[PDB]
Amino acid sequence: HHHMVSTLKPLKIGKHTIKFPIFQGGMGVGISWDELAGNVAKEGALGVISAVGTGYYKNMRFVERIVAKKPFEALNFYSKKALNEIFANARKICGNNPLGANILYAINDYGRVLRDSCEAGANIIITGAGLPTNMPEFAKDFSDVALIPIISSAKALKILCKRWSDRYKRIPDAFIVEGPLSGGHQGFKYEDCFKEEFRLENLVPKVVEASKEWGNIPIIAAGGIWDRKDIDTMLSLGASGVQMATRFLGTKECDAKVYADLLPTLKKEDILLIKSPVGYPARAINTGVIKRIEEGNAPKIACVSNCVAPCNRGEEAKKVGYCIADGLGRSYLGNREEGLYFTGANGYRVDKIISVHELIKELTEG
Amino acid sequence: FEDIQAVIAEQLNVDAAQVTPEAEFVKDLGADSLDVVELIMALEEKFGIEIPDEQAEKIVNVGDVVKYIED
Numbered sequence: 001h002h003h004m005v006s007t008l009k010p011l012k013i014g015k016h017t018i019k020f021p022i023f024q025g026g027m028g029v030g031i032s033w034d035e036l037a038g039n040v041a042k043e044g045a046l047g048v049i050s051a052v053g054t055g056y057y058k059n060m061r062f063v064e065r066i067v068a069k070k071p072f073e074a075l076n077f078y079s080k081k082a083l084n085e086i087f088a089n090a091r092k093i094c095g096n097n098p099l100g101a102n103i104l105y106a107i108n109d110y111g112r113v114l115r116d117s118c119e120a121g122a123n124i125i126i127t128g129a130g131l132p133t134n135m136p137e138f139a140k141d142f143s144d145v146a147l148i149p150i151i152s153s154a155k156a157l158k159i160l161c162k163r164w165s166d167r168y169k170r171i172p173d174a175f176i177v178e179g180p181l182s183g184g185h186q187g188f189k190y191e192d193c194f195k196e197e198f199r200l201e202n203l204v205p206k207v208v209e210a211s212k213e214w215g216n217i218p219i220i221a222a223g224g225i226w227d228r229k230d231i232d233t234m235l236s237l238g239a240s241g242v243q244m245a246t247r248f249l250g251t252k253e254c255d256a257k258v259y260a261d262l263l264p265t266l267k268k269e270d271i272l273l274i275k276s277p278v279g280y281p282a283r284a285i286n287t288g289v290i291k292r293i294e295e296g297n298a299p300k301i302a303c304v305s306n307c308v309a310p311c312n313r314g315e316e317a318k319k320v321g322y323c324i325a326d327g328l329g330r331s332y333l334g335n336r337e338e339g340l341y342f343t344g345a346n347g348y349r350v351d352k353i354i355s356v357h358e359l360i361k362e363l364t365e366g
Numbered sequence: 367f368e369d370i371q372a373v374i375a376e377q378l379n380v381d382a383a384q385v386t387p388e389a390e391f392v393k394d395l396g397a398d399s400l401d402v403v404e405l406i407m408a409l410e411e412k413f414g415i416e417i418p419d420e421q422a423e424k425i426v427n428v429g430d431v432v433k434y435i436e437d
């Protein structure tokens with residue numbers, strides 16, 4: 001058997017077309033950087049560079065100031081120099097193929113980092129972890145940049161569109177609808193993450209229906225999508241595309257090489273939903289800092305990187321027992337005892353680490 | 367105040383008698399986060415003001431909103 005062409009159609013979001021209607025979802029602190037995102041884009045999908053915690057890149061090679069072995073304040077945690085370098089090496093692999101930058105709305109200096117990402121050469125900005133009513137204020141000098149909020153309801157879509165038109169004379173170029181089986185921070189209160197009412201298959205039609213009201217904005221389904229069979233399910237319900245992350249977390253090109261070591265062993269019951277200083281529930285693996293807190297021998301919390309506004313500078317980190325900047329940075333550096341590790345609900349289905357090329361083919365043949 | 371009360375009443379599908387300067391949109395009037403945003407939305411049109419999110423995050427009870435419209 002040879003490699004066969006896709007019956008999936010190319011996807012247009014902004015001025016940019018991607019050959020396959022698949023986003024590789026942004027994965028925070030060094031999981032989806034230059035190698036991963038560049039290869040994904042080279043293979044015809046949308047690679048998405050996570051702009052969070054770039055100071056940790058290559059063990060903080062591009063920071064001006066380190067306190068307690070951590071990047072000091074948002075200027076160093078979100079290092080522009082590092083981000084520029086990640087994008088440059090990603091473009092060594094993908095050239096002019098489109099790239100996203102993923103930026104959580106909750107971060108301090110959100111606007112500066114959005115602008116940084118445009119100047120680093122992102123084609124598309126994707127933002128969740130909030131209701132991003134002010135995404136466009138910093139993009140006003142980057143007309144070519146597409147803007148994509150992550151939402152969990154049609155209500156959110158309507159609100160965003162109205163507020164964007166009012167303030168910026170713009171409407172989103174697309175929406176990602178992220179269901180409750182996704183990795184990282186969930187867009188629902190802990191309680192709601194279990195109801196049937198919110199599965200992805202029930203949300204996508206509602207959001208699609210609400211989007212038609214605004215000129216048929218593209219809808220990208222995310223959360224729990226595993227193979228081509230799932231892709232076609234979401235497209236049949238009206239999604240224009242899909243965003244996947246766990247699967248790409250299971251590739252060799254993933255930038256945080258420790259995951260190539262940890263996912264194949266992952267049992268379903270060691271995947272938990274935990275609290276976060278960001279103020280949303282987060283899906284994580286029962287390892288690293290999470291085991292240390294269970295044992296009482298977790299790291300001291302001392303707010304050095306000041307990564308997100310809702311934590312209030314270590315306050316909520318202490319209330320929940322860990323610092324997410326320290327944990328995620330530690331994971332990228334390979335710290336198995338003190339790192340924080342995330343996964344989608346399907347993480348346990350990973351048994352072989354496969355190449356991005358082989359993954360994209362399995363999802364796109366015929 | 368009577369005009370603030372009327373928009374708060376209609377938006378949350380709630381009687382003008384419950385909209386007391388003490389009543390909190392979260393707890394007393396029964397609104398979820400996006401009800402809040404729609405409401406801010408309706409107030410800054412009705413009275414031609416802008417309420418930035420920074421300023422808006424701080425308000426939880428209708429007195430807080432009343433006082434902000436005031437100044």
Ligand SMILES: Cc1cc2nc3c(=O)[nH]c(=O)nc-3n(C[C@H](O)[C@H](O)[C@H](O)COP(=O)(O)O)c2cc1C
Nearest residue numbers: 025026027028182183184223224244245246342344
């Ligand atoms: C390890 C990991 C890290 C993630 N980090 C982010 C992030 O930084 N920003 C974001 O918007 N989404 C993040 N997510 C969510 C993904 O971008 C994606 O939307 C979601 O995981 C898709 O579901 P799937 O993993 O089941 O495909 C993360 C997911 C994983 C698994």
Ligand SMILES: *P(=O)(O)OCC(C)(C)[C@H](O)C(=O)NCCC(=O)NCCS
Nearest residue numbers: 128129130131150178184185186187399
């Ligand atoms: P409210 O102010 O409590 O509601 C917040 C809402 C639900 C509006 C927000 O849109 C949201 O939670 N979005 C989801 C962002 C996301 O899914 N992921 C970030 C990944 S790390």
Ligand code: SF4
Nearest residue numbers: 303306307311314323
């Ligand atoms: S203490 Fe809170 S704000 Fe400071 S770096 Fe840790 S998670 Fe971020």
